[PDB]
Every structure is written in C-alpha cells, then in structure tokens.
Amino acid sequence: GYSDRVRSITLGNSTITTQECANVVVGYGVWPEYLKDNEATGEDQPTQPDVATCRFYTLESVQWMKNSAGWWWKLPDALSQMGLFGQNMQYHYLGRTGYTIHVQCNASKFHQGCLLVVCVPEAEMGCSNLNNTPKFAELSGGDNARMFTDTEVGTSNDKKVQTAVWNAGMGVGVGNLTIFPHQWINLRTNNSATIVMPYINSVPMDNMYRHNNLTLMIIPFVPLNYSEGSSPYVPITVTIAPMCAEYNGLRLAS
Amino acid sequence: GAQVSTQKTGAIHYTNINYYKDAASNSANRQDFTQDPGKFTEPVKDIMIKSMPALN
Amino acid sequence: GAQVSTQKTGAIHYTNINYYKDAASNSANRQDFTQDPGKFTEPVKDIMIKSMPALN
Amino acid sequence: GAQVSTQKTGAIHYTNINYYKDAASNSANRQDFTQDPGKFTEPVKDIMIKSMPALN
Amino acid sequence: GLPVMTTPGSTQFLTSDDFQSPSAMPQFDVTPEMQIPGRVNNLMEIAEVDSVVPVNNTDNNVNGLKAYQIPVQSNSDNRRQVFGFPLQPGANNVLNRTLLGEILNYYTHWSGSIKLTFMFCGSAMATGKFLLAYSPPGAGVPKNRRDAMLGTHVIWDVGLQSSCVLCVPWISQTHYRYVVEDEYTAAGYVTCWYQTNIIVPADVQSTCDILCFVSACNDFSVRMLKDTPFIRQDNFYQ
Amino acid sequence: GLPVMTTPGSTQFLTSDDFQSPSAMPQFDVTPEMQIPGRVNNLMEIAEVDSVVPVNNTDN
Amino acid sequence: RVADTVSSKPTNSESIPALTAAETGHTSQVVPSDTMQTRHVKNYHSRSESSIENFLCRSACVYYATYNNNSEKGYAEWVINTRQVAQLLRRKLEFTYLRFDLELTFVITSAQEPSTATSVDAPVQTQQIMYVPPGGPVPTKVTDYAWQTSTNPSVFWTEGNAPPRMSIPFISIGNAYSCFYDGWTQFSRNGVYGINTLNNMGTLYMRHVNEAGQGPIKSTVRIYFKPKHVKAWVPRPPRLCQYEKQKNVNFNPTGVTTTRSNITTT
Amino acid sequence: RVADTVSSKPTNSESIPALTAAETGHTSQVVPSDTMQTRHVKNYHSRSESSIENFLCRSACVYYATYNNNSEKGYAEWVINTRQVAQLLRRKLEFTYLRFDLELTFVITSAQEPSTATSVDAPVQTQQIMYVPPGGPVPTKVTDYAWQTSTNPSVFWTEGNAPPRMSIPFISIGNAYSCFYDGWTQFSRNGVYGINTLNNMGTLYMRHVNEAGQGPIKSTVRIYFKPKHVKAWVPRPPRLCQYEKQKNVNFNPTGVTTTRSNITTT
Amino acid sequence: RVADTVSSKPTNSESIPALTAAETGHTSQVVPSDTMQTRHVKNYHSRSESSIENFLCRSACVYYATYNNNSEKGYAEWVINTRQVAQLLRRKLEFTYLRFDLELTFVITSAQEPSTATSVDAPVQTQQIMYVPPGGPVPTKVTDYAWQTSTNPSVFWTEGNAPPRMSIPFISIGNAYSCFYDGWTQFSRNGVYGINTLNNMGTLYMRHVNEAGQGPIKSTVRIYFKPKHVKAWVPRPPRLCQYEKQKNVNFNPTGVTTTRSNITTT
Numbered sequence A: 001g002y003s004d005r006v007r008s009i010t011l012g013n014s015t016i017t018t019q020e021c022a023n024v025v026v027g028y029g030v031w032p033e034y035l036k037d038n039e040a041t042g043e044d045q046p047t048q049p050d051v052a053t054c055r056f057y058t059l060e061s062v063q064w065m066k067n068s069a070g071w072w073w074k075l076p077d078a079l080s081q082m083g084l085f086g087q088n089m090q091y092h093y094l095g096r097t098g099y100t101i102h103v104q105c106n107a108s109k110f111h112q113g114c115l116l117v118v119c120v121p122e123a124e125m126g127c128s129n130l131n132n133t134p135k136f137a138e139l140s141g142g143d144n145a146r147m148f149t150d151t152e153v154g155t156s157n158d159k160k161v162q163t164a165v166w167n168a169g170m171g172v173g174v175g176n177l178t179i180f181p182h183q184w185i186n187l188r189t190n191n192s193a194t195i196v197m198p199y200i201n202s203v204p205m206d207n208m209y210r211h212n213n214l215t216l217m218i219i220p221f222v223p224l225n226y227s228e229g230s231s232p233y234v235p236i237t238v239t240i241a242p243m244c245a246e247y248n249g250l251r252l253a254s
Numbered sequence B, C, D: 001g002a003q004v005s006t007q008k009t010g011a012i013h014y015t016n017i018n019y020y021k022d023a024a025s026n027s028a029n030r031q032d033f034t035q036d037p038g039k040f041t042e043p044v045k046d047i048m049i050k051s052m053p054a055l056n
Numbered sequence E: 001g002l003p004v005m006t007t008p009g010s011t012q013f014l015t016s017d018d019f020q021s022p023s024a025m026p027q028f029d030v031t032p033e034m035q036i037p038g039r040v041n042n043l044m045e046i047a048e049v050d051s052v053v054p055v056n057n058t059d060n061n062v063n064g065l066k067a068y069q070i071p072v073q074s075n076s077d078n079r080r081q082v083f084g085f086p087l088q089p090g091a092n093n094v095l096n097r098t099l100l101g102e103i104l105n106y107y108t109h110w111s112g113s114i115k116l117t118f119m120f121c122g123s124a125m126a127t128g129k130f131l132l133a134y135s136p137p138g139a140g141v142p143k144n145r146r147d148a149m150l151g152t153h154v155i156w157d158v159g160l161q162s163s164c165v166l167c168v169p170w171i172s173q174t175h176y177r178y179v180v181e182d183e184y185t186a187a188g189y190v191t192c193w194y195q196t197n198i199i200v201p202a203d204v205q206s207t208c209d210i211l212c213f214v215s216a217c218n219d220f221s222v223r224m225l226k227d228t229p230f231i232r233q234d235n236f237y238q
Numbered sequence F: 001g002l003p004v005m006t007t008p009g010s011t012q013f014l015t016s017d018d019f020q021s022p023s024a025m026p027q028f029d030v031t032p033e034m035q036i037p038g039r040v041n042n043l044m045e046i047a048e049v050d051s052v053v054p055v056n057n058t059d060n
Numbered sequence G, H, I: 001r002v003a004d005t006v007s008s009k010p011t012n013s014e015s016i017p018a019l020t021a022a023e024t025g026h027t028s029q030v031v032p033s034d035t036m037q038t039r040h041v042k043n044y045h046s047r048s049e050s051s052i053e054n055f056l057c058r059s060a061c062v063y064y065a066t067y068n069n070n071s072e073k074g075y076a077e078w079v080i081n082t083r084q085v086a087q088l089l090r091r092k093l094e095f096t097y098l099r100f101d102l103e104l105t106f107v108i109t110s111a112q113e114p115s116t117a118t119s120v121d122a123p124v125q126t127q128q129i130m131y132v133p134p135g136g137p138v139p140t141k142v143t144d145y146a147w148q149t150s151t152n153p154s155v156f157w158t159e160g161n162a163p164p165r166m167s168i169p170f171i172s173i174g175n176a177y178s179c180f181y182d183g184w185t186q187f188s189r190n191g192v193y194g195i196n197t198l199n200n201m202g203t204l205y206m207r208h209v210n211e212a213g214q215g216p217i218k219s220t221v222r223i224y225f226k227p228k229h230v231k232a233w234v235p236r237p238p239r240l241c242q243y244e245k246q247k248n249v250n251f252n253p254t255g256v257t258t259t260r261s262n263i264t265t266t
C-alpha cells in the first residue's frame, strides 16, 4: 500500500479513477450480495441480467452557486431511463439491487466550501398545505436534480413539497443526519466521495415504480467563496452503478 | 421446564417456569446485553489505526 | 402424570398435568396434524400415473 | 433455590424460596446477629488489662 | 384445596410489570426471520456517532444553516476568543438538541467522557493555530487566555488532516450527574482562544468557518429512565 | 396456606380458551368406537377436490 | 459493563492520536488516556438501563374512547394504529423496522348521568370488548347478530376486579413492521402516498352487556400497549417538529434550538 | 407443512402430464414444475389453522331465553338442539357424522323494571340452572318439588363472579351424531320425516333462587357450546339457500352466484 | 446470647481490678465476679430483639394528604422526605449514615360530602398513585397529558381489597444516606445551609380515576415506610429538644432532666 489517496474502480464497462480522495464508506458494514434460496418466496426463476446492467450511469450536473441550499435525488427512479437498467425495470415486476454512489466536485487551492453527501433509507417528505399530500412532479424529477430553498415553502400550491433546508423536509434536525452512511467533501483536502449501499428493506423484493428505496441528499454547510480573479463556475456531477441486480415476474411494459 | 438463573446484583438465583403453549406468553428478555458498535461508527472499508495519520 | 412436550414455533417446551377422573375434562388435541388425501381425490381402482395417457 | 434453615426456639426447620428477579424483593435478614464492642468501648492504642494499674 | 393467602399489592396494574399472560391467537406461525443490514442492539450505539453542534445560535442566526459554523477572522490584536459555552449535555441551550442531547433527555443520570471534534474549512492556503481549554468549576468563564491555559487544554494547527479531537475527561466527586441543570453537580466550561493569527496570501477570502462535532466516549452510561419534556400534545390527531 | 397473587385477565371469558373443567356426568362410558368409511382429518382435503365453475353468469 | 482506564506516562514520539481527517465518515476512537496522562481506575458501571429490550417494554396510553348506555347506538369502535398519541409515537421513530409482541390492557371506568327516578341501585356492569380483523362482519347496534363471536376473540370482564390483559404474536404480512413508507399504493403512482397504505390491523368494538338502568351509566375504555420482544434496525434521527396529522408527516418549520444572547456568552 | 418445489429444465419428450381424462372421476396431480420450468424454493408453511380440531373448537351462541321474577311462573325452559342459530348450524353441515365433547357456559345478565316503592336495594341473585334428561320429572312453578334435584345435575352461581363452565361426554345412542336423516320414524312410513325424529337430548330449566324484591329483576341467560374432541366423516357441499325452519330443510331457490354484465367482462 | 458468670473465692492479692483512670477515654471491663465473690450461673438469654435489623424494620406513618373530588384541581401531591413525623424521625437520628431498602404501603380511605340530589349510589373508586422522579414532567389538573405514565411507575388499586405494597432499591447518589449535613450548597458559601441541600427524592401524585358522582367523595392517603436491609455507621446521642422545623435543627433550650426536691431524697 503506497499513496492511500488514490483509488480505482472498474465495474462492468466503465472505470472511475480519482487521485485525491478520502476513504470509502461501505454501507452498514455489508457488501451487496445476491438473494439466497433460504429467504426467497418467489416461485419463478430470477434473471441475473448481465454486466450490461451493473455499469456507471452518470446523471445530470448542476452549478454550485453562492446561495444554493441543497439538491436531492430518488435512487430507484433516477435510473429509470438509463440503458438496459430501465428496460428490465419496467418489463418485469420485482427486483432488488444495490448501488455505488459517487460524487465529483473539484476546485483550486483558492476556493473554499463543504458538502454533506448522505443517503437516507425510506425518505418521506411533507406537503406545503397540511391537509393535502405532496404531488409527484414536485417530489421526483426525471433524473434532474430537485433543490431546496431559503424561504420556507409559502402556502402554495397545496401540493408542493416543503423545501425547508434547516429541517431537511423530513421533520428532523439537520445536524443529526450523520447517522446514515455518508462522507464530507471539503475542497481544502477532498475531491470526491464514494458510498456503497446494500439493499435494505422489509420484504425480500419490492416493486420499482411504486416504492422508492433510498434518497440521496447534498447540502453545503459552508457556502462557496473566492476572491476576484478566479473561475466563478463550479459544477457538480454524480455517477451511480447498480450492483447485484435481479428480477422476477415478466409481463408487458408500462 | 424450570431454570435456576442469576439475578441483577449491584456489585443471587431465582427460579422460573413457563405455563402456556405459545411463545408470546413468556416474559421479556430483559437479561440480555449484546453490543457491537462497528456497524455505525467506523463503517469504512480500509481499517484505520489511530496512531498512523488519517490521510497519508 | 406430567408430560413436557413441545410448543408452536414460527421457524420450546411446556408442562401439563391432568387433575380429574374422567377424560372429558382434558383440553383439546390441537397439537395433532394427520393428512391423507387419497380417499377423496383419486378414488379410482386402477392406479394412474400422470406420465402415461389417461385412457389408453 | 430453596433452603431449609433453623427457627427461633426458646430453650425447628422452615423452608423458604425466592420468586423474583431483583434482590429488594426478599425478606429482611432478621436471623443475623454479629457483635463487636471494641470499636466504641476501649478505642485506646495501648492495650490495658484490668489487673495492672491504669496509669503506671 | 391448597389453602393460601394473598399479600398486599395484588389486583393492581404496574406500568412496568413483567408477568406472563394468555394468548389471544393460539398456534400462530409468524413469518420466518429475515436478515437486513444494521441492527440497533443498544441506545449507546447511537450516542457514539458524531453530530454537528449549533454553537453560533443567536438573535437571528437560528432559522438557517448559519447556526452551525463558527466564524473565524484574521485580526490585529491577538488573544481574541472564538467561542465558548458551559458543559452540560441535555441541560445547556447548545447541547440539548444534538444527537447526544436527544438521547440523554430520556434519562436522569450519566457518567463518562466526551469527544469534541473540529474541522477547519478554509482555503488550502490558510494557516493558524488554536487553543482548546476545559476548566472545571471553581471559578468559570476565564476572561484572559492565560487564565484558561492553566486548565486542561490542547494546541491544534490546521492543514493536511486538519480535524482535531479534544477529549473532555470525567472529573467529578460523585459517580453520576443530573441531566437537569443542578447547581450542586455542575460540570465545567469549554472555550477556545486564538493561539496565532490567521495568515493568508493575497487573492484569498480571509473569513473562514469551522464546524464543531460532539460524541460520546466508551466509558459512558445512563440510568433512571424518564419521559422527555420536548414533545407536548393537545388533542388526538384526527 | 400458599400465598399468591392474581395477575390481570383473571375471571374473564375468552371465546377461544383452552382450559380444563369439571364433568357433569362422572364415570360415563361412551359407546365403543366404530369405523365408517371416509374421515375428514383436515379442511384442505376438501379444497383439492375439483368442482365446476359458473363462468357464464350473466343477465338471465 | 463499561471499560477501564490505563495509566499513561509523558511521551514525545510521533504517535499523534489526536489529529485525524473527518471527511472519511469515521468517528474517532480516542480515549482520555491517549491525549493526557491519567490514573488507572476500573469502572464497575453497566449499560443495562439503555438497551432496546429495557427501553421500550413499558406500557403507555394509546386511545380512550367512550360509549354511552342511553340508546341503541351506545357502542363505540376504534381503528387500530399507534400514531395517535405523541408520547409513544416518538419513542418508535428512532428506528425504521421493528419486531415485537404486545400485552394489551383495558382500564375501564364508569360514571352516572342525570335522571328523574326516585331511587337508583346499579348492579355491576360487564364487557365484552370484541376484535374484528380486516375483511369480516361488522355490528351496527347493541342488539345485532355479530355479537355472537363464533370465531372472533372477545373479552368479558365484570367491574370491580383486576383489569384484563393478554398477549399478541407478530401478526403482519412482511418480515418486520414498517414505520416509514416512501411510495404510493396504486401502480399508476396516483392517490394515496403516506404510511397508512400498509396499515389496516383490524378494528376494535366495545359494548355494555347489561340490559338497561335508570342512570344511565357512561363509560370510557383506555388501551395500553407494551412491546415485549423488540428488535430494531436502521436507526434515524429523532423528531424536531410537532405532530399535526395522524397519517402524514406534515410539519411547521421551527428553529433548530433555543437561542442565547451571544456566541461567547455562557 | 406444505411440500417444496423442484427445478425443471426444458423438455421435448412425450411425457404430457397435462392432457388427461376427467370422466374417470380422478382429480389430477399436476404441480407447477411439471408444466413449466421453475426454480427450487422450499416452503416453510404449515397446514395447522385448518384442521377440524382447530376449526371447530370455538364457542358460539346457541340460544338466549329470559325469565321474569314477577309471578309464580317466572322460570323459563329450553329444549336442547343445535339448529337454532345460523352461524353454528352451517359450521356443522359440511360433514355428516360427527363425534365430540362439549364445554357449556352461561353468561347470565340482569335488569330492573318499573316500580313504585320509595327505595330499592337488591342483594346479589343466584341460579340454579337445572338439566332434566328425557323421560323424567318436570317443574311447573318456582316453588315445586322437582327443584330438589336428588339425582339431576344443577349449577348454583351468584352474580358477580366468573361464569360457570363444565364438560359433557359423548352422550348419544348411536356410534356418532347424525346431522342428516333420510327416512321416517314410524314403521308404517307415515307422519314425521325430518331430522328431529332422533333428537331428544333432554331439557334445560332456569330459575331465580332469591325470594322476591321490589323491582323486580328480569334476567336473560345465554348458552355457549364448544366442541372439544371432534371427529368428522363423509363431507358434503355447504349450504347455498337461507334457513327458514328449525327441523326441516325447506328453502327458497336462488341463483347460484351473483351476476356480472358479460362473459368476457372483468 | 449473653455470657456466663464464674465462681470467685476470697482474695488478698494486689490485683485491684476496681481502681482505674477514666482520663484515657476507656470504659472499664469489670464484671461482678471480680469485685465480690459470687456463684456460677450460666445465662441463657439472647441479644436478638435489639439489633438494628430487628429494631428498625417496622412500618410507621410518614404523611397523609387528602384530595377532594369536586373540581378540576382535585389531585394532591407530596414531596418526598422522612423528617415530617416525630416518631420515625428520632428513630433515625441515633446514627449518621444508613443504608436500606423500603416497602411502601398506602392505606386509602374515603368519605361522603353534603349534596342535594335525591338518591346516591357510588360504585367503587380507583387509584392511580403516581411517582415522578426529579427533573421530569408534571401534571396540573386531573385531565392532563402527564397521566399517561409511559415510563413513570404507577399503581392502580380499587377500593375494597388489600392495600398496595412494593419494594424500592437503594436509590441515592452517595454510598450511604446522610441524615446530618454540615455545610452549604453554593461554592461561595452563601444561602442554604441545612440538610435539604442534598434531598430531592422526587415527588408523589394521587388522583381519582372515576369520572364524577353526586357526593362527591373525599379521600385521604396514608404512607408507610419499612426499612428492610439496614446498615448503620457512626452512632450519636439521641434528641433532647422537640422538633420545630422540617429542614432545620432549630430548638428551644430546656432542662437536661426533670427535677427532684433534694440531692439525697429518694
């Protein structure tokens, strides 16, 4: 072992290599594995698809402004339109997978900032109006980032999610969000963040279009900054890889 | 089936019998303590000793 | 006469005594399962295997 | 755990069992008598016998 | 039959009783056990996790993420203080809300240590040293830096694995303490002073912030379970 | 005598209780067992028998 | 349990167990004997009053519903759920998937009402609290056919004795209870979204068995749950905003903590 | 428990476990792994909540008869039979010849009536429920000689305690109970035809033991049977038309099933 | 255990076990057989009814507080302490540091009050005596949220049965109870000085569970402590002046003993 700060990951067809990174946080202490034949209840045979599904699908990018609050994604839904993971997701009826989340954000030695890369299992949300429940087009984007705000929510539109960043939108203390697995991105000494998450859920296999497994949240606790005479555009990107996929219950598409 | 087990002393024994068919009629398993902190604190892949520096 | 028998577990023991003279004072025989389907399904005389055709 | 101990006679036995988990549910330790008077009477350093005179 | 009498206490209802009882549905077969990742076998597993502290809570800086970052400057006259607060988990207005402050309110006693972590989040050209003191209570809030240097302290310098951990030991006459604010069983104080200024080359913003984590050590415990006074209900939620 | 207390739930009536009880007629001798053909030892013995289905159920 | 301490002497090496990196998501493991020189004291404490077995297994109120004796609609009913009281709700939301048994208990009470008859002499009353699982018959009056209870489990209890108590197995569909659900119920992804999509649990009915009187009496039952054999997975941060809906998570944003008049003020 | 499954591979032989003849009165024995290729999953279920021992042994109401305290004819009587309630009748008519024990239970209740006296203070009441087998003495008032019960079995119970319960052997004339009878009682083949030709079973009497009062109280008893050690023979199809007579099988013809608006409509 | 005696004969030596010095703070050890000639008698007595185990372990009254049923503030409360009754206080002040368990007991009573309604028929009442440790929630009315008792220990008891009793461990902060404290509470040595500086012990609440009536009833509870496993250290002289304050030692100086009319008068 020489020069700890360099990693390398070759999963299937893609490879992501960082030179300046921290350690790798591996789930709750387990590596994602297939489903044993002692805990299954499906009566069909599964379908370990290919290397063609365990790949590195990169999602959209965004700009880290100087007033931005935070973004998030829904994991089983963000990869709905990507390659052969989005075809075996809708043609079948069941499935279980694990992911390998990644994040890139690189700045010079004259910038500053921080971020909290964390994934929350079973993330709920709260509508703006108390009586109603949130919409769907205001809860999940089509692999495009959803963003928090500074003002709380207003009183509209009776279905919008409440983007109150200091409460996280779930109704908890934002400082206590370090229980779920995570990693910090400090531009002083960091350039990325890796996270390996297994499949955590009550039932053995669950639908993909009806119930979202996890939720990826990004929150900058310390805003960007820089003196005059430097690049004012700092973008962010994320790369995710389905790990150990399986399916059951073949039907027509939807 | 009676077991003569230990008690909770500050720093003896006490008998016990079950009388029903099911398993939901017994008492709680209060006298059981099992700890493992490694799952939540230190979930990293590479093991880190506190003597060596953190990042190289 | 006490018997220490098994219990109904999802996937232990439990004692029992009788205190009366007759036999109609005991409890039900719930812990008894005996199956035989051949009387109602397939009462035919000649035995039929599912591989061979039914009627010649 | 049952102990068959003695009783308080003027001048026999009597059984006893505990039924709980803690130690604050037992009965008092009435049948215990331990005496030592030397702490309060005669706390002096040099030992004094009653035959010899007190002070030289 | 067997003749026997009934002592007092019979036919009551203890809220914390441990007694057997009949079964409504007999011969029920639960679903077989499943093995999911991550099992909380104790409530001290959660305390030993680290969570940031809302130190800079003030008149307005509470409805934003600005209550989590301590502001550090680069000034002329040395010995300036950066922050400070008394040491009382679950009692003080700063630690009564964190991950250790929300578990310590379900009980009444506690005894152990505390690990306070910091993280300088300035640019990579920034530099500086800091002091971190814990003065037990005989006379608190040291005004000068030289008053605080007599107590337990540590000296931390930034850059290349900046984060430093101060370990508040356990120094008390008795064995335990009260989560509530009790003047007989006070704990102490905590402060941090400028050991050396914040120097920076040109073309670098001089204002740099710091985050303050908190966690429990391994000789920690609790006792005397109670009910927390935070949640309060007015009527049944229809 | 033996001193003991009674937990809650006593002196009730569960519809599905399994308890012993006295006997009204003691020393009764039932008629000896007889062996007739066909004994239903379970209710899944009946389900596995086939029965037609009223599929074409409509207005009339 | 807790661990002991160890005696330390002065050092000048390059061990540095203090400085570390927090970006790696790794909580440190520094003890007090590492950063300073200390004595040797063997701790005799024990982490026993904090385990989930001892922390959860206490009874608490859930719901008290009353039913008058006046008319043919005296009976009262309740739909099972645990998110109706604030004390026991928040003691569940520090985990995600639980597994336990229960020991029910009903502390029934009575009271008189105004009347005009000359004298009153009310004999003891009896109940008769029924349980109807999902998808079954239902009563509509206090003289219905459903009260026979040929297969439903009922409890009969006369006023004046100890309260009724009984156990309950892990009755569910999944391999563990779910306190948080993220997703809808319809495959079209429309309609109901919250946690009640996978919560039916049955019903609960109560009724006076006595014929009638001259008062007439009014009564109020009180439920009490006590999770017996717990198992918890996937902890999460506690709640910070008050509850305002029974089957939602809607809240009103509040400050993270109370305020002090300075940053350096004690 | 139930049986497992077995892994199947593609085949092109002439096994044909699908096509068979149904004229032979033989239900098939095809499992899913025979007709298509499947996985291997070992089932852990158990057929326990469906056996006749667990399916029948639950108590149910049979008959509730009331008797006032006013006059010398207060007492009330009932003739034994099990075809008086719809819930427990149909749970018997899936078999033909049964054999079981029983555990009786009487949930007695009371109630006041209008009166004119100044005050009322009613001490506890007592019963006194008797059993008269067929061919024996009979009482006609609440102060008769028959209430001595020199050989008849009686039950005395004071209001306020738990209800009375007791067992009963297999008291019958034949080797098993008969729920359906096809044939008459007279050798001339005339007169009575139904099932009550071989049902006497005795009687059942109840009475207030207290002298009198000023109310006076009214009461209603409720019976509860619980077949304990069952044995069933010769099953038959369940019922489809409602009951309308106590000792007949008369019915009113109805449709075999509810209707849908098409043959292909879902 | 007591000791025997020994036979002594006349002596003329220089043993002199009588004359000694009392300045050395040493109690003598002279027995009757040393100073005069006596017989030999073996004592069969036993010092058993005087040990601290048998001397202290008897129940005694501590405090009786009453609470009416009239209004929304019926409930009554009490702060724990043992220096409120004269009999049990002085039986503690012969030692300095104790250590024991306890067995509580509550002898609850009732009584009627004047009213105007025609008739009255009061069913049995129930309690509901709660215990709130220091630093916890508090109730303010008889219909509050605090009465759920999710973690607090409560006792429910219906009038007419035996009184409730329970045990209590050695719940304290120090290694033994302290009955006398010499020193203040503030480090500045100002303010409170007496013994209550280290006495909180919690609270104690009581309440009627019944809804209401027409009386309405009034009640008075009575506490009873019984130290079970005692251990005493550092005895001291008993008290000679009456008690006059609950948390002080203030007194009024009195004569050391009653008086006789002479020095030589018998």
Ligand SMILES: CCCCCCCCCCCCCCCC(=O)O
Binding pocket: E024, G080, G081, G082, G083, G102, G104, G129, G130, G131, G153, G154, G155, G166, G168, G177, G178, G199, G200, G201
């Ligand atoms: C007379 C006996 C009746 C027994 C009634 C059984 C009550 C079932 C309790 C259901 C479990 C509690 C709910 C857990 C999760 C949820 O649904 O919110």
Ligand SMILES: CCCCCCCCCCCCCCCC(=O)O
Binding pocket: F024, H080, H081, H082, H083, H102, H104, H129, H130, H131, H153, H154, H155, H166, H168, H177, H178, H199, H200, H201
């Ligand atoms: C006080 C004890 C009285 C005991 C009374 C015994 C009641 C006998 C029950 C007869 C069996 C039930 C009827 C089965 C078949 C039928 O006759 O329809």
Ligand SMILES: CCCCCCCCCCCCCCCC(=O)O
Binding pocket: I080, I081, I082, I083, I102, I104, I129, I130, I131, I153, I154, I155, I166, I168, I177, I178, I199, I200, I201
């Ligand atoms: C329903 C159970 C309630 C149990 C209440 C426990 C009462 C604690 C007793 C405290 C010890 C007595 C005081 C000793 C010394 C002092 O404080 O003066």
Ligand SMILES: CCCCCCCCCCCCCC(=O)O
Binding pocket: B001, B002, B003, B017, B019, C015
């Ligand atoms: C219904 C139980 C009655 C009370 C128990 C009396 C003792 C009988 C012997 C029990 C021995 C069982 C075996 C064991 O010790 O676990």
Ligand SMILES: CCCCCCCCCCCCCC(=O)O
Binding pocket: C001, C002, C003, C017, C019
């Ligand atoms: C009337 C029964 C009293 C309770 C039983 C106490 C134990 C006595 C010993 C019983 C042993 C009987 C033989 C057996 O184990 O089956």
Ligand SMILES: CCCCCCCCCCCCCC(=O)O
Binding pocket: B015, D001, D002, D003, D017, D019
């Ligand atoms: C719950 C206790 C039931 C009454 C005791 C019945 C006797 C059982 C055998 C007990 C033997 C325990 C060992 C001992 O003698 O100390």
